[PDB]
Design a binder for this molecule. Structure first.
Ligand SMILES: C[S@@+](CC[C@H](N)C(=O)[O-])C[C@H]1O[C@@H](n2cnc3c(N)ncnc32)[C@H](O)[C@@H]1O
Ligand SMILES: C[S@@+](CC[C@H](N)C(=O)[O-])C[C@H]1O[C@@H](n2cnc3c(N)ncnc32)[C@H](O)[C@@H]1O
Ligand SMILES: CN(C)c1nc(=O)n(-c2ccccc2)c2cc(Cl)ccc12
Ligand SMILES: CN(C)c1nc(=O)n(-c2ccccc2)c2cc(Cl)ccc12
Lengths: 380, 380
């Protein structure tokens, strides 16, 4: 019954993640002034350039130059020696109003609770009892390794670190009637941008001793664990200079690390009317409520929408064999306890609040007791 | 045992799909002259703009203006009345060479068979016996509905159609020991950009009679099937003008429609050394070989890599309960029959051939007998 599973994560300075954070900094800036802002902000990053492209209709007065540059500063790209500098990069803006055709079909002259979905699409929520936070251990560990790198960079412990990083964790699991049980860490990859002075052996030693050992419990590591630390051998060029980034290109890092399922929609840069985000957060909330409610050890929920239509077109459940209840029974419990219209999700999950930039690195789920992470007490 | 499942697809003029097609037109243009071109071409589209951003190291001499404009022309955006025109749009280029740090760690001075993976990451392949092409019926039907729209647009049957479209199909299934059996179509959504003259009732009637009935077998449609046709009510503004597009923002449309799993990587604009594409194609090839070989009715395969390392770090199998063989036995059969090093996949799947633009709409899988769609005869 043993098997392997792998997930990855990326750091705050990974170029795709820079774009997600900037998109969400823009969304938050709008929501701070106009809780009803309609935002669809894509970000593109390449050497010396942040471009904003998309559609925003809002009563806010937002200084895009300042918002973008402050987000880049926070990430840590503050000098040309690091390959990118918030003070001196180009910020280009190609933002128009929301299409009036979309606006009239989705939200104009609609009661909020009865607002239409902002697009068609499908979304999934997942939860697993293998960790207290109801997330896969593979992706939890991968995120924590990137967070540790940023911590040691920011506290000056490892001053040769730069913001761009990737990690990948392969766990060996056992299974019991569909639930999964972590046994050990089989393989770890860490790649992180670094300065010109540090040598490879110094980096590899620090990554094992100060990063991996500070994150992964020793009980999971043994003489057979495989370590791929700085496997490319050199990573001085990094950030947008090494690889163009775009918003919504880390959707699996943002969610479940390959476990569960994904409908394809990106989260960052979108207000609540874009069900790609709000309905995925609500589906996570449902899945976590089913697991924390003791109805199943792990579960997947699908929901779907049509643009302009408030109620979901479909809802589906897969319990992996981890419930005594059938999937039909669990679906009835979901329908009795949740209303997945976007105009109701916004109220339940407080989705006009400007907390989105906080979600845009280290995963949207399993952290910080956001509203979608607080289970609903189920009645049945 | 009945349940619903939903998948979507988009047309050739959907702005994200425009970007995937342009990225792959650029890749093909390079490969026509330099089979060993290193290409990582992202495309961004917004009103009046195509921007290319990324990294290319190649001996080819490519005229980006011509390649981009010809791709847009093929899609059908050829007049300002349609919201976008290949003749007069802005084409901006922000392309640099591949990072020398990546090049030295991946492929420089390496035997081709022993080339390293171009990045870390995880990838999945999936196959299901529910259709001859081994794809989910939900996504097959969703793709065919977009193809039908483009066909009726191009043949002048429905001259009010424009290139930007989305479709979504919810199928009601039964199941038998993990295999899935389509019963009926529960809901169909179609949204398509249109001219200023056609009325809503004319469009809805044509979408039902000339599009849906021409694609979906009557046996799946009944008096209870729900139709959401032009549900926003008006879709005159479309293409990049209505919504900014980016390469790699339709990764679920490109693959399995929510079924199976996804590792997060985008396909378009990347040469074979980027395992996001090559290893996902090889994983599809493995999954389809297991199903067509009669070892299982449906199956999911995971593979993962570290940048600079040729052999996969992990391989995993999930057979949904549809094989008499254990997943451990199926994994041994896979390891005996396949070599998923990128430098071997390139040879098996002929991945230097410039056929990539053909993959960039209507899904990468289940069509045209590409090499990854031709099962391998298994020995065990
Ligand atoms: C390897 S790059 C993708 C391929 C790249 N666009 C190319 O031109 O080959 C993807 C990510 O890997 C990381 N990366 C960049 N340079 C790297 C290096 N020298 N070694 C390891 N990882 C690197 C960065 O996080 C980057 O965003
Ligand atoms: C609805 S838009 C995404 C949200 C949009 N960025 C906004 O500002 O609200 C996503 C896709 O839906 C389609 N679309 C655009 N305008 C539409 C309309 N008026 N009705 C229906 N679908 C539309 C296009 O395929 C577009 O790429
Ligand atoms: C318990 N177990 C053996 C697995 N559980 C799973 O949830 N999936 C999985 C993941 C995503 C989508 C669908 C299934 C697996 C997938 C693979 Cl490739 C291997 C093992 C598993
Ligand atoms: C047979 N059956 C009931 C389903 N089969 C599946 O493959 N998945 C599924 C899809 C992606 C990832 C993991 C599982 C389902 C998922 C849902 Cl939400 C509902 C039903 C199913």
């Amino acid at each position: 019954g043993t098997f392997l599973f792998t997930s990855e994560s990326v750091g705050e300075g990974h170029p795709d993640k820079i774009c997600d954070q900037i998109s969400d900094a823009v969304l938050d800036a709008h929501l701070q002034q106009d809780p009803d802002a309609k935002v669809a902000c894509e970000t593109v990053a390449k050497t010396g350039m942040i471009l904003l492209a998309g559609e925003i209709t809002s009563r806010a007065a937002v200084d895009y130059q300042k918002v973008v540059r402050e987000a880049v500063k926070h990430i840590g790209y503050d000098d040309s020696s690091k390959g990118f500098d918030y003070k001196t990069c180009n910020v280009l803006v190609a933002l128009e109003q929301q299409s009036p055709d979309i606006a009239q079909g989705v939200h104009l002259d609609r009661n909020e609770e009865d607002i239409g979905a902002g697009d068609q699409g499908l979304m999934f929520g997942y939860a697993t009892d293998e960790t207290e936070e109801c997330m896969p251990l593979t992706i939890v560990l991968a995120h924590k390794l990137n967070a540790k790198l940023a911590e040691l960079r920011r506290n000056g412990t490892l001053p040769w670190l730069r913001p761009d990083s990737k990690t990948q964790v392969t766990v060996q699991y056992m299974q019991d009637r569909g639930a999964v049980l972590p046994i050990r860490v089989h393989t770890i990859v860490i790649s992180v941008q670094h300065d010109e002075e540090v040598c490879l052996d110094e980096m590899r030693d620090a990554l094992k001793e100060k990063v991996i050992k500070a994150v992964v419990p020793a009980k999971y590591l043994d003489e057979d664990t495989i370590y791929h630390l700085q496997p490319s051998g050199r990573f001085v060029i990094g950030g947008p200079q090494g690889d163009a980034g775009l918003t919504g290109r880390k959707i699996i890092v943002d969610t479940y690390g390959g476990w569960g399922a994904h409908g394809g929609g990106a989260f960052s840069g979108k207000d609540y009317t874009k069900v790609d985000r709000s309905a995925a957060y609500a589906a996570r909330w449902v899945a976590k409520s089913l697991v924390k409610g003791g109805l199943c050890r792990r579960v997947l929920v699908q929901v779907s929408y049509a643009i302009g239509v408030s109620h979901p077109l479909s809802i589906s459940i897969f319990h992996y064999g981890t419930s005594q209840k059938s999937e039909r029974e669990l679906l009835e419990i979901v329908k009795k306890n949740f209303d997945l219209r976007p105009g109701v999700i916004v109220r339940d999950l407080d989705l006009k609040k400007p907390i989105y930039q906080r979600t845009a690195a280290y995963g949207h789920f399993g952290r910080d007791s956001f509203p979608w992470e607080v289970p609903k007490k189920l009645k049945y």
